[PDB]
Design an enzyme around this catalytic site. Structure first.
Site, PDB file in Angstrom:
ATOM      1  CB  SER A 150       2.252  -6.215   8.581  1.00 56.26           C
ATOM      2  OG  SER A 150       3.178  -5.355   9.162  1.00 56.26           O
ATOM      3  CG  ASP A 333       0.987   0.323   3.482  1.00 60.79           C
ATOM      4  OD1 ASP A 333       1.293   0.830   4.277  1.00 60.79           O
ATOM      5  OD2 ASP A 333       1.369  -0.870   3.358  1.00 60.79           O
ATOM      6  CG  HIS A 390       0.271  -1.806   6.534  1.00 66.68           C
ATOM      7  ND1 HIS A 390       1.208  -2.286   5.756  1.00 66.68           N
ATOM      8  CD2 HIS A 390       0.503  -2.122   8.103  1.00 66.68           C
ATOM      9  CE1 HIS A 390       2.073  -2.982   6.272  1.00 66.68           C
ATOM     10  NE2 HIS A 390       1.473  -3.266   7.706  1.00 66.68           N
TER      11      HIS A 390
END
Ligand SMILES: *[C@@H]1O[C@H](CO)[C@@H](O[C@@H]2O[C@H](CO)[C@@H](O[C@@H]3O[C@H](CO)[C@@H](O)[C@H](O[C@H]4O[C@H](CO)[C@@H](O)[C@H](O)[C@@H]4O)[C@@H]3O)[C@H](O)[C@H]2NC(C)=O)[C@H](O[C@@H]2O[C@@H](C)[C@@H](O)[C@@H](O)[C@@H]2O)[C@H]1NC(C)=O
Ligand SMILES: *[C@@H]1O[C@H](CO)[C@@H](O[C@@H]2O[C@H](CO)[C@@H](O[C@@H]3O[C@H](CO)[C@@H](O)[C@H](O)[C@@H]3O)[C@H](O)[C@H]2NC(C)=O)[C@H](O[C@@H]2O[C@@H](C)[C@@H](O)[C@@H](O)[C@@H]2O)[C@H]1NC(C)=O
Ligand SMILES: *[C@@H]1O[C@H](CO)[C@@H](O)[C@H](O)[C@H]1NC(C)=O
Ligand SMILES: *[C@@H]1O[C@H](CO)[C@@H](O)[C@H](O)[C@H]1NC(C)=O
Lengths: 413, 413
Positions: A150, A333, A390
């Site tokens: 991330s 994602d 993700h």
């Protein structure tokens, strides 16, 4: 090893771990103290590598990584029971889960000022990694990998550069999962992503092309056309603010269609567990500290983003050619879509080695399947995980383990 | 109702159905005899509509529809047990599952010549539908819908046109699931699909653009550039012939990575069931007929495709404005990808009614979720099913039922 930081009996385990694990505090810059959780390799600690794992946010905890992604054990939905994880990354590595920056999770500072920025956080992590090896000198020799997810697409390369400067640290590589490497490529690619995954339709696609694009090169990033902005806003509303799961498009959004949780994410299981006073005790957490949250709104809201692209940092890490780099992405994602990072890697201009192909995983009964696609360059690979969001290790643990194992072992994917 | 065709005790049911169901043969053209399986509405047959369901292929059986998609009961993996289906379409409709054309499944002809073509199959179905109402006169009044999947994107509109000519038949609408409406749009859209879902990468994408496209339009359909062809062939290999599940990209391919089965499809469960001599007897199948297969290689291999686009048929069906039309698509299917059909509908130029938006479904605990997107015109709607493959009712039964229920009931989706 700091003996007092050793974790003795961890509530929610039926049977105790076969490996040592420690939980305590690393000194950062100023008066900042970062909570760490270190799980020794289940197979020969003394010769298994050292992996740093950072979750992003900014403001979110790396204990999410441990407890819901690839730790040796994962918290179960009752918030109380922990089950071992057969695909845990500490099967073959010493994994250091670090709560950072100051204020996230159980990490704090004496002055409690938690506004920070990319350069300060980098320095803070670097100094904490330094403090780690003072406490764990017997691991100074081990191969050292920096891994994250991330927003750690920013944390990790910036950190790595600082680590690159210290030859006492045995840096061998870094890996970033659905990372934020470039806002511009992320933003432009997301918009294509949205259309071609069926979220936009043709009237809106036409408008976008018309107002944001001339002669087949689009600016969905910082376009000043006011008619473009009105449409980018619409896209932003469809993708992020209308019921879809931005972390995983084909997954339901936790708690129907409408403290900072990540969006469409239920954080009850982990929070329930880590706020258990006995768990805090087992993990040597001082009592006076506030409750644990997966993310800190303060940190996030007060966070100053400085780097707009990791192009410099990666070339600077590639120039030396001592370092093995992997960018991997879940291909469903929308927070950090796979194409943005594929573009980012491709635009590094490195010497192509292996041409783009499938990569396989063996499943029970199913036989071999395609887990995703991989494109290798000299010291840097890009790789997708088909049907993962993700948080790759949660959506596809086995594929995530395989990838990681093959990464650690300098092996073809 | 032909009493002799009534299905008495069907092997694999614990408790017998509350609704009547018949299985027998409808006369088509020449000496052709099509096997049908008719399941009465579970709720008021006399006022529930009449739905024809055709699977595509060409050469594949509509009993796949019944037994694995939306019949009142679905065959289970042991090939022996049938379990009731809480999302069955015959909850609110009289569904006529028709094995067609001649030679598919239990359908045959006296002369056994099974080479055929779109115009002949259309006529054959039309005459079988005629023969149906001779046998089931009490259903001549009921609202009549024509529905299909896959290659039935050709079967259904062509059929509908013939039905449109006969006002004795009470045609109210038609629906097509992941249909083949236009080879050109299907083919051009698939290639974008492939790139933007992460299967192609940039070298290949660049080549394709260079050789198959000039500035704001591509020809990936019938392009004569020899360098374009070499690349389209590569795309064809990646998509269709390299281990992915063409019916559903995020699903594993049945039976590892390399009689006509569909590709990546296990047809054991249904075949095992329908070849049971007692099942054939229960379904009034004459003994001398060959074993049941989900598809017939002969039919498929000997099949002559004539219509290249259903544009005429749909406008011809829309001009009258008596008919309610739906095209729906699973958005992770690559056999008949959703965009191809969205382009096909958009290029019909009808008066837009409802602008493109989400549509929701209520789940147990999960609350309301986004099931897909819908774009309405007067009398014709396009709609996706998010995260569903080529066979919508299998991948997402509840969403498929909701859609269908709202279609039958002239309701907003
Ligand atoms: C899709 O399939 C349909 C149904 O098969 C075709 O229509 C059929 O075409 C065949 C031949 O292609 C016709 O056969 C004829 O049958 C009649 C029976 O009355 C005879 O007049 C005729 O026999 C004479 O001709 C033979 C050869 O031409 C000789 O060897 C005989 O000895 C004798 O002298 C012949 O057997 C069918 O009548 C016809 N059926 C229907 C319902 O139309 C489609 O064929 C297209 O449409 C046809 C009218 C014709 O124009 C064909 O040439 C067209 O192709 C077929 N469509 C395609 C595109 O293939
Ligand atoms: C990112 O975050 C860092 C760390 O907070 C900022 O750098 C720090 O800025 C402080 C206040 O601007 C500096 O404090 C000074 O310290 C001396 C004593 O040595 C005092 O006498 C003086 O009055 C100031 O209080 C602090 O030195 C500095 N820390 C570090 C490690 O560099 C940073 O601010 C930006 O860079 C620094 C170098 C300053 O020039 C700032 O003006 C500038 O904004 C933050 N970055 C951004 C873009 O805001
Ligand atoms: C979140 O998780 C808890 C514990 O697993 C569960 O009981 C609850 O139903 C979930 N909340 C929502 C809103 O889905
Ligand atoms: C296909 O299904 C049958 C029974 O349903 C099963 O025995 C067989 O193992 C299946 N094959 C695969 C590849 O799943």
């Amino acid at each position: 090893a700091p003996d007092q930081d050793e974790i003795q009996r961890l509530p929610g385990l039926a049977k105790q771990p076969s490996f040592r694990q420690y939980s305590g505090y690393l000194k950062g810059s100023g008066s900042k103290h970062l909570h760490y959780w270190f799980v020794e390799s289940q197979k020969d600690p003394e010769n298994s590598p050292v992996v740093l794992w950072l979750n992003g946010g900014p403001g979110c905890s790396s204990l999410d990584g441990l407890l819901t992604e690839h730790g040796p054990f994962l918290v179960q939905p009752d918030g109380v029971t922990l089950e071992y994880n057969p695909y845990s990354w500490n099967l073959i590595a010493n994994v250091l889960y670090l709560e950072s920056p100051a204020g996230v999770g159980f990490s704090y500072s004496d002055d409690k000022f938690y506004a920070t920025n990319d350069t300060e956080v980098a320095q803070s992590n670097f100094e904490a990694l330094q403090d780690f090896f003072r406490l764990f000198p017997e691991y100074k020799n081990n191969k050292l990998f920096l891994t994250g997810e991330s927003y750690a697409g920013i944390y990790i390369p910036t950190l790595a550069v600082l680590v690159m400067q210290d030859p006492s640290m045995n840096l061998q590589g870094l890996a970033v999962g659905n990372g934020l490497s470039s806002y511009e490529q992320n933003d432009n690619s997301l918009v294509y992503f949205a259309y071609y995954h069926g979220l936009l339709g043709n009237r809106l696609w036409s408008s976008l092309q018309t107002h944001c694009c001339s002669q087949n090169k689009c600016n969905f990033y910082d376009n000043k056309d006011l008619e473009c902005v009105t449409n980018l806003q619409e896209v932003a509303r469809i993708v992020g603010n209308s019921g879809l799961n931005i972390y995983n498009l084909y997954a339901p959004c936790a708690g129907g269609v409408p403290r900072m949780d990540p969006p469409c994410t239920n954080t009850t299981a982990a929070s329930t567990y880590l706020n258990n006073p006995y768990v805090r005790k087992a993990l040597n957490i001082p009592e006076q500290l506030p409750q644990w949250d997966m993310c800190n709104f303060l940190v996030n809201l007060q966070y100053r983003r400085l780097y707009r692209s990791m192009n410099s940092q990666y070339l600077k890490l590639l120039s030396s050619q001592k370092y093995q780099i992997l960018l991997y992405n879940g291909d469903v994602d929308m927070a950090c879509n796979f194409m943005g990072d594929e573009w980012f890697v491709d635009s590094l201009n490195q010497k192509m080695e292996v041409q783009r192909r499938p990569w396989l995983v063996k499943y029970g009964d199913s036989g071999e399947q395609i887990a995703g696609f991989v494109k290798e360059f000299s010291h840097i690979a890009f790789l997708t995980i088909k049907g993962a969001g993700h948080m790759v290790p949660t959506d596809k643990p086995l594929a995530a383990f395989t990838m990681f194992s093959r990464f650690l072992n300098k092996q073809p994917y």
